[PDB]
Design a protein around this ligand. Sequence first.
Ligand SMILES: Nc1nc2c(ncn2[C@H]2C[C@H](O)[C@@H](COP(=O)(O)OP(=O)(O)OP(=O)(O)O)O2)c(=O)[nH]1
Ligand SMILES: Nc1nc2c(ncn2[C@H]2C[C@H](O)[C@@H](COP(=O)(O)OP(=O)(O)OP(=O)(O)O)O2)c(=O)[nH]1
Ligand SMILES: Nc1ncnc2c1ncn2[C@@H]1O[C@H](COP(=O)(O)OP(=O)(O)OP(=O)(O)O)[C@@H](O)[C@H]1O
Ligand SMILES: [Mg+2]
Ligand SMILES: [Mg+2]
Ligand SMILES: [Zn+2]
Lengths: 552, 648
Amino acid sequence: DTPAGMMMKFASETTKPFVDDYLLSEDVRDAVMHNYIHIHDKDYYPTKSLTCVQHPLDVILNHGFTAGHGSSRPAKRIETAAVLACISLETCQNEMHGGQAIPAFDFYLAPYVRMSYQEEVKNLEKLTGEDLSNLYDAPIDDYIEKPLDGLQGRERLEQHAINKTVNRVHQAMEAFIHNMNTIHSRGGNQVVFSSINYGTDTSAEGRCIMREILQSTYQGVGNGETAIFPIQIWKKKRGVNYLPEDRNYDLYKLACKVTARRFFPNFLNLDATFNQNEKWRADDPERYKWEIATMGCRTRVFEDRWGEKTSIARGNLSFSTINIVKLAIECMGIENEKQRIDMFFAKLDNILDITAKQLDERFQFQKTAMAKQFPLLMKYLWVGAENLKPEETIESVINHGTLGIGFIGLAECLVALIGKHHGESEKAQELGLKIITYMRDRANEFSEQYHHNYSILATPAEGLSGKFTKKDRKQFGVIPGVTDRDYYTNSNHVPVYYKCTALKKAQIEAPYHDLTRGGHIFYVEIHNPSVIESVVDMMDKYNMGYGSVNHN
Amino acid sequence: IARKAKTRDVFMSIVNAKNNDITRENANMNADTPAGMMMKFASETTKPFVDDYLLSEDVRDAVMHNYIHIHDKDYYPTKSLTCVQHPLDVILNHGFTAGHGSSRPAKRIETAAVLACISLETCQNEMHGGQAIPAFDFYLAPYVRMSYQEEVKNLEKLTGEDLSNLYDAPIDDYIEKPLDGLQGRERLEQHAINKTVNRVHQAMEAFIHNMNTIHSRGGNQVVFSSINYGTDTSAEGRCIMREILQSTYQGVGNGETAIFPIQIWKKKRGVNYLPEDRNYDLYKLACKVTARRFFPNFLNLDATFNQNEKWRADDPERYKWEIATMGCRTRVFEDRWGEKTSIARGNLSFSTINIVKLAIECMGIENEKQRIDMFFAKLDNILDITAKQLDERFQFQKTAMAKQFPLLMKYLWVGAENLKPEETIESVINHGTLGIGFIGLAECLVALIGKHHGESEKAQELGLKIITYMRDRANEFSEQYHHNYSILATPAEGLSGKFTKKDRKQFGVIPGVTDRDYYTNSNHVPVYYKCTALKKAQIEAPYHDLTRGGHIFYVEIDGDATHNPSVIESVVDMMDKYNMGYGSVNHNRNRCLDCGYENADAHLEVCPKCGSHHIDKLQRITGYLVGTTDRWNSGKLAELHDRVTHIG
Ligand SMILES: Nc1nc2c(ncn2[C@H]2C[C@H](O)[C@@H](COP(=O)(O)OP(=O)(O)OP(=O)(O)O)O2)c(=O)[nH]1
Ligand SMILES: Nc1nc2c(ncn2[C@H]2C[C@H](O)[C@@H](COP(=O)(O)OP(=O)(O)OP(=O)(O)O)O2)c(=O)[nH]1
Ligand SMILES: Nc1ncnc2c1ncn2[C@@H]1O[C@H](COP(=O)(O)OP(=O)(O)OP(=O)(O)O)[C@@H](O)[C@H]1O
Ligand SMILES: [Mg+2]
Ligand SMILES: [Mg+2]
Ligand SMILES: [Zn+2]
């Protein structure tokens, strides 16, 4: 409705009918035209843009960043460090069509908590004059606060100096939450996606910054208002937290209390046998670079078939969703069950072949793009973008991305077309695991022949919640139990209308997580912080992954 | 087939990152980025839509025959206003809610400088022009004293006294005095003054660094911002001015020039101009920065058309009757149904009128008296069409929902705090001004009849008559359509080199009329003709009074005069002697893509620090500042390569 918002749809409605006939081959055109394959984010097809990336902020903060004609200096304070983090999330958004996230936010804001107070003792000293050159190289327990009830001594300056950074850190983090919640900079939707990760830092500086993050979030933004960004993620690796005899167990009790109030902080299971790495040293500082860090878009980039297994600076190239619900309708006329399942696999075989080539054609289109089109994404943020001339091509470093073959309505696929769905049916549970394994096995075959990184993704319900259903419903009238819901259920998720307990959902949805390596989420909808620990307790027994709790 | 055989090659040209296919119309945009490409696709769709579905046939025939040009035709269906002024007082003392966020009133200087950047960024996405902030020094003054109250209460808890008497302590100045060689309370009270000097310096540092950075990016319309200051006498007020000057004079990043914001210094006699005046010392410093960073600009408050009769020194300088200038050269000072103030108001629309083609049409007649009578007859008819065109565009912008302009129609527009989101903005839109422009007056008919005005001859009488004829006619339309028309010297960025090519095709290469390509800027002496600064001032001075809708006295000063602060002062005195209102000094700087260093040399190829060969030219265009000569238009690059400098 805004002048900037209405300008974007003029370009979209112009460039969307253009790409259909002048960029696609005849076979993919018919498959796309016949409502079989969906191309996510087709508006930016000519621009040759990528999906997302995990922001490395340690490099940006230590040297600043110069995008366009705007330049900045390295941060030397808590206020300067937090504010520059927001800008790094604002410039890159205009160069992509997805979202941003901060991996291990705790580690980044920790030297400057000390450094803002390290030189503060030199300003609190000149009033007195005594050479107090010992307030930095000492083991601080928690950067604690006191009621200031008649403190007295020479070392009263030592307690006053540390008292100066706790208030300043609290003020510093208020800027970060407000900046990412009120600055409308993106074209169109006018909101920049963001996400941060914290919960696995135990140092004195890290414990202070993590507490204030929870303390500031407990208060809100402006006047007692829950923030929408950034999305909060909590780590629960065993041996650092989640155990009573742990250094960070005290904050974990507070974190569940904050979650009970604002419902913002999500949890990530670092013990899943696929969210697990062999290079986690307990003593090496900055425990990131070998951990799992997700986003708000259920995007998971962990294992690379050519490179290193990490989630830093990587992301998706582009992903397409395959309508498997439609294929079952065409095979509903076969009387013999063995023949019926034979046809569905044959029909699924043809669509999968086109989609692998369909993603391959868009990949070839994107590799010709120049690095000058992404001033910040292809300069500091991407994996191998530190050496890329503006006039070069992205074909060298574009391979460290994920092409996603997603699906929708697995429950809708089997609810009435083939018997029952994967809820109150053990036979359908075996059938459902067979199909996803069939897609997973084919994606392995596509990876060998097309030489890419194909993964099965649980596509978030955003932009494709009702598009598929309406088009197919008209073609096939009213199919009872399938095309009478106006929305297809999300990937490998128990349908909402099927009543079940949290324990039962954990058991049913656990096996799918090892299959959908491209992204998954566990959703629990429902005061006491303990009940939050119940979710991670059941997530502990069964190998699951990313988890979230909502109220609505 | 041509409707789908050349429209396909247009999109391909955009996709392949070409250099000439209308992708270099605007220098503030980066067309090689995904954000830039989407804007190009949308602009190339609506402009054909406007021609055959929006404007009438009489105006259309002028457009296709290259008679009347419209400005910002891309945003025509969006119903977007041009510019506005920002009363920062409302947002810094009560708080504001933008989108799903909110805020509370600022308590120190760090949380007050950051709220000003938010309003400028937010309001840009609702208009297609610039943004301005008047009385900048006055608005930030109270919170420096509020910073003094918080630090005292902080000292009270750490000490335990009753320092209520220090809440309104009459201290002489906020200048920092180091605590060396003193004892007792000199290390207990002087500290509270040296503490807050560094606090104010950082806040002004953040404000500047949050205005150039946002302009370097952006998926929406690029951010165009400006501020005004100069006439504050309070101790807190002088503190704001002295920090903003030092912050600007220091620079963004690695000591590089800030493209934005635009800064203007306000000159008045008896407040800052005379040596006896209090702010004379800061007055001298402003000339030091504008010679080195091309800011602040100088606006004369003593001009006859800039004087105000509701200004009293007993009040705190009454920062409401001081004229302020928005981005480029737009000014909104007079009003027939409102106060003579430039607070929370701006421009609506403006169009340029082609006059060179009218005279070359009549060049076949050998009777001088006959030509002029027919020339006036054509001009009267053409001006009638343009007055309709601005009014016709005016009728389109009236019916815009206030919810389409959230920040503009809630805090920043005059009397806009009384309208609900679903209401129409027509009840308060009339405070804007409609501009009628012209181009190539020097080569309109004077360069056809002998020589143009300003060529050391007496031909200015005819040139003055033509502009005055429009000036009288502009007033006639004001009394006719019940609007407020004002003639403005139209900037030449994209329209420089558009009319000329069609006339050459239709008529041919004729010296004076054509073969000059870019054409001379409105009311200005031929940029290819030599003149002194004083003589150029004398010829163009009477035009400033005739164009009460925007004007600028541009002086091209060589690099050697940058180091001398007297040349800027002489120009201001030269502006004072005559009735010139707005003037600026331009100069060519050189940028570096690695270090970012700028120097004042005539031409640079390798950066002294790094050694890179990507040394671009940092120069000024008719309305703003930008580098990256790879974004200088073909018509404008011709005008740039023929500019004449004035040593004085
Ligand atoms: N968007 C944005 N908001 C900021 C920034 N820094 C501070 N704020 C917000 C936080 C609050 O909503 C507001 C005022 O913060 P203050 O620390 O001055 O506190 P205030 O005096 O409102 O409340 P208090 O007396 O401390 O309870 O400014 C920033 O960099 N960006
Ligand atoms: N765009 C933008 N830049 C900011 C903002 N706040 C601060 N900056 C810039 C100002 C500086 O370029 C940088 C912070 O500089 P510091 O305060 O760390 O000091 P600097 O490195 O200049 O050294 P110094 O303290 O002068 O010795 O970040 C903001 O809100 N937006
Ligand atoms: N990025 C920008 N965002 C907002 N306003 C801008 C921007 N760039 C320029 N402007 C405004 O637009 C004005 C340009 O008017 P000008 O007379 O130079 O137009 P032009 O180059 O002939 O073309 P047109 O009016 O078609 O864009 C500038 O003086 C300034 O006020
Ligand atoms: Mg506070
Ligand atoms: Mg500093
Ligand atoms: Zn250099």
